[PDB]
Every structure is written in structure tokens, then in C-alpha cells.
Design a protein around this ligand. Structure first.
Ligand SMILES: O=C(CCCCCCC(=O)Nc1ccccc1)NO
Ligand SMILES: [Zn+2]
Length: 258
């Protein structure tokens, strides 16, 4: 039926409704650190998040997401491999049922406990619906989470998850500063790819940060208490909402660092 992450509707089934699932620039991929090419032409990333305005947090039945006001150039991503200004729209996570799985991208086959996606769209296309139809429409910053010490900047998110336990629930979520989610270093890998959920459009410049952030076991445990189901339905824990690595095909992964 409708897509999801289960045995009968999971990633291996998506191609029947979304044939681009077997396309030429699908995501995620395994990053082979010894075959990635250092590209000295790549610029440092410019992340300008000081004026970000968060609006709401919502359980969309596949993940939870925090949405931002993107009606002006308030929180923007520029530089790196990008040409032009990309506005922050939302962030969300992918995570596992166990600490040794949950990320979408992998690094030399290593899986992390979760992966944070900060989604931005290219302002030259005017709105995000137009941007997803363009090969350079979106830029997604991917950040790995490892289990270790707690991340204090994540705690405001963890503490509101009880309010959005089931599909379709939303809550006001103002004055959240996404700078608290970034690692110290902005070194990155980049490659052209796709959304990792339907409709799997091939519109994404991926920027995957090398340095993971550390979150505590108690913080990630709280993600695993969310539900895929809506209020009143059989309880199905929201875990393992990650797509497996896809073939690299004719693409090169570039590194900003040696
Ligand atoms: O695929 C990803 C990362 C990119 C997610 C892109 C979602 C875009 C969004 O929130 N709004 C939108 C979706 C479809 C069409 C237009 C806007 N993770 O699974
Ligand atoms: Zn994602």
C-alpha cells in the first residue's frame, strides 16, 4: 500500500510506485574515504543561522521534523560546492532500533546511530516545490550522531517528543537555535544525489560532515519511543526509518579536506 519502512512497504518496494528509485543519482551512498577525491577548488561552507525562526515540530509518520520560516533569507547556506543562496526549510532525523545502525550514509561501511538532515532550497527557484524539479534545487547538510556524551543543544527537541508521539501530531516549537546541532569542524564530503524518501527526486547536492556529533543514550532512546502509527492504531515504534546505501554509479565523491 503506502510506503514506509516495514517488510511489506519498505525501501525494497519503493521502486514500484517511484521508478526513479533505481535511477542514476540515488541516495544515500557509502562514502569510501580512500576513493573520495580531495578538491582544493571547493570553498568552505558558509552557514548563517543567527536569524533562524523555528515554527513547529511535527510527527509526519516517517520521522519528526522541525520547520522554519523560509519566507526571507533568514537562515541560509552558501559556499562549499553551491552556487547561490539556499534557505533552511526544516530538519529531521533518521535513526535505528540499536546504536549500531540508523544512519543513511555510511563511512567505509560504518553505520552511525542516527543522521540529521538540514534541508535547504535554492532561492532562485522561488519555492521548494519548484526546487525539487531541478538538479540543483536542494542542498542537504547531513550530520552523523554517535552515542556518547549528551548534546545539550538537542535536549529541547528531546523534551517535546512526548507531545508528538503519533502520526499527525504537531506542536509550537519557537526560538530553537539550530547552531546547537553543528559539530566543531565543517569539513565535508559532497556528491550529487536524491531525496532518501519518496518521491526520491534527484534534486539534492549532498554535503555530509566528517565530524559526528555525540548524543547520549538517553537522548536517542527518546527518538525510539515515537510511533509510526496514528493515535488509536496498533502501536508500531518509529525505529529504523533509514534507506540502505544505493549504487554510486557514475558519480565521484569529493572531499573538502585532505
Ligand atoms: O530525503 C531526505 C532529505 C531531503 C528531504 C526533503 C524534504 C523537502 C520538504 O520538506 N518539503 C518538500 C517536499 C516535497 C516537495 C516540496 C517540498 N531525507 O529522507
Ligand atoms: Zn532525511
Amino acid at each position: 500500500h503506502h510506503w514506509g519502512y516495514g517488510k511489506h512497504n519498505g525501501p525494497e518496494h519503493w521502486h514500484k510506485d517511484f521508478p526513479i528509485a533505481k535511477g542514476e543519482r540515488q541516495s544515500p551512498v557509502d562514502i569510501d574515504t580512500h576513493t573520495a577525491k580531495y578538491d582544493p577548488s571547493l570553498k568552505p561552507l558558509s552557514v548563517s543561522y543567527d536569524q533562524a525562526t523555528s515554527l513547529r515540530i511535527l510527527n509526519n509518520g516517517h520521522s519528526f521534523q522541525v520547520t522554519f520560516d523560509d519566507s526571507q533569507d533568514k537562515a541560509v547556506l552558501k559556499g562549499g560546492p553551491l552556487d547561490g543562496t539556499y534557505r533552511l526549510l526544516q530538519f529531521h532525523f533518521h535513526w535505528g532500533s540499536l546504536d549500531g545502525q540508523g544512519s543513511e550514509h555510511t563511512v567505509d561501511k560504518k553505520k552511525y546511530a542516527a543522521e540529521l538532515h538540514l534541508v535547504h532550497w535554492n532561492t532562485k527557484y522561488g519555492d521548494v516545490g519548484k526546487a525539487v524539479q531541478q538538479p540543483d534545487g536542494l542542498a542537504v547538510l547531513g550530520i552523523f550522531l554517535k552515542v556518547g556524551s549528551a548534546k545539550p543543544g538537542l535536549q529541547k527537541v528531546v523534551d517535546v517528543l512526548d507531545s508528538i508521539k503519533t502520526e499527525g501530531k504537531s506542536a509550537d516549537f519557537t526560538n530553537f537555535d539550530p547552531r546547537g546541532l553543528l559539530p566543531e569542524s565543517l569539513d565535508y564530503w559532497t556528491y550529487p544525489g536524491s531525496l532518501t524518501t519518496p518521491p526520491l527526486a534527484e534534486c539534492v547536492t549532498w554535503i555530509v560532515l566528517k565530524e559526528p556529533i555525540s548524543v547520549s543514550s538517553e537522548q536517542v532512546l527518546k527518538f525510539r519511543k515515537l510511533n509510526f502509527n496514528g493515535e488509536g492504531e496498533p502501536e508500531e515504534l518509529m525505529v529504523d526509518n533509514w534507506r540502505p546505501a544505493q549504487p554510486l554509479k557514475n558519480r565521484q565523491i569529493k572531499a573538502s579536506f585532505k
